[PDB]
Amino acid sequence: REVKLLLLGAGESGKSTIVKQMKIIHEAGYSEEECKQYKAVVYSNTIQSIIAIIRAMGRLKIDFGDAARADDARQLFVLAGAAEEGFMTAELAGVIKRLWKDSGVQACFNRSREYQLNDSAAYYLNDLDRIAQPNYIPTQQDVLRTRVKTTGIVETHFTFKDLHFKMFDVGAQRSERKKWIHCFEGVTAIIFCVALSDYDLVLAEDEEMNRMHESMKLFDSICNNKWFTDTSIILFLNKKDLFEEKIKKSPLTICYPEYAGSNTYEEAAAYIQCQFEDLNKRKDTKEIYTHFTCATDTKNVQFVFDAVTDVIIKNNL
Template identity: 45%
Template structure:
C-alpha cells in the first residue's frame, strides 16, 4: 500500500502511536467538536480500524472504500447497470469553484437530476468562507435547480444522505438543530422530527407545486439501503420516461 509519500512500512511503524493518541480523552473531545473545523466524518472509522488497515497484507473491503472521501472536481461520467438497464451518471463537483462547470452537463439529454444533501451538516459551515451553513447552502443550490425552467419536465430525485450520522448528532447533547434553525418546532432529539423538518425545508423551495420531487433518506455506507434506493430510482425514471413517450 502506498499513500502519498508514506510507505506501508512507515505507516505500520507509526500506527501504534496513532492508536494511542486516538484513545486520549482530549483527542476524542476534539473530534466531537469537528463541526467547528473541516474534519471528515470518516476519520473515526479509519482510526477505529487502524490495527487492521496498518497490516502489510491489508486489502480494502467494501466498507473501507465506502468510507473514503474525495471531493469531485470537474465533470465525471460513468455507466452503471441497474438490473441490466444501462444508466449514464454525470457527477459534478458541489464546491462553489466547480459549479460553473455544470453547464457542460446539459449539452446532452438529461432525464433526471439526483441531488445529494448531507443531512448531518446542519451545524457545519462551508470550507470556502467558514460562515455559511452547509445545509442552507445545499438548500439554496437546490432552489436554483428545482425552479430552473431548463429542468422543467425532468424528474428531480432528492437524496437526503448521511442519515446514520444525522442520527448520531440528534442523540448528541452538544449540538441541537434549534440552535441553527429556530423555526424548528419538533423534538430536536427525535430523528423522525429532524428528518421531516429537513425534507419540508427542501420541498418548500418549489415555486411550482406540480414539480415532482422524489425523495429518499440514504446512508452511502449502507449497501442494502443504497441498493434498494437505486432500484426505486430506476423504476421512477423509467416510469416517468415511459409516461412522456406515451404523451408524444
C-alpha cells in the same frame, strides 16, 4: 432505452460514493487488486484525520490527557512531514493509536463541528489495528469510506432492467455554474444529494456559512431551473446514519433557529425534507421524489435505486 442521470450536490454529500456503489451493485465491483489501489488513500485519509484533530486542539486550547502524548504528537509530524505519500508503519500505528486513545484527543474529536474533519475519520481510526497490517488490503467498505475529491466529470454506464444508464458526476463547482449546466438540458433525472449531518456545520473558508443552507440555495437553483422542467428531481437526504447519532446531541435549532418541534430523528428529518421540498415553486406541475440514504451502505443504495428506477420507468422512458 438509454437513461442519463446527473448527480448534483454540494461537496461531500455522497456523489462519488454513489458512483462507486453503482460499480459494486451493477457491475464488476472492487477486486482484490482494485482495492489495493485505495490502500494508499486509506493511509492518507487516516493520517490527515488525526493531524486535523491534533491541530484543532491547539486552536481550541484543549490539552492532552497524558502529557506523554505531546511527544507522540511531535512524532506524528516527523513521520508524516517526511513521507510524501500515504504509507503506514508499525511505529506510525502506535503513535496514532496512543493519540486516538487519548482523553484530550477524544474531547477535541467530540468538538469536530468546530473544525474540518473527514466523516470517515472515526471509522478508519477505530480500525487502525486492521488497516495497519503489513499486508493490509482495503475492503469494499474501506473504499466507499475514502475521500478523493472529484476534479473531472465522472461517468458510469450500467444496465438495469433492460434500461441502460449513463451517470454523470460533475462535482460541486460545476453544479454551481448557472450557465454551464445548460448543456444537460435534457437529462431524464437529476439525483440531488444532501448531507443531513452538515446541519450544524460551516464551510472551512467561509467559517460563518452554514452548509445545509448553502445546499438549500443550490437545490433552489437547480430545482426551479427552466432547463429541468422535464427532468425528474430526486433528492437523496444522505448520511441518515450520521444524522441519527448527531440529532440526539446537537439541536436542529442550530440550523433552523425557528424549528419548534422536538429533536428526535423522526421530527428533525421530516423538517429537513419539508424545508427542501418547499423550495420547489412548480409544486403542482413538478414533483420531487425524496429518499433518505446511507450511500456507504450498499444494500440501502440498492433498495433505494430500485425504487428510483421504477419511477423513471413510470414517467421518463
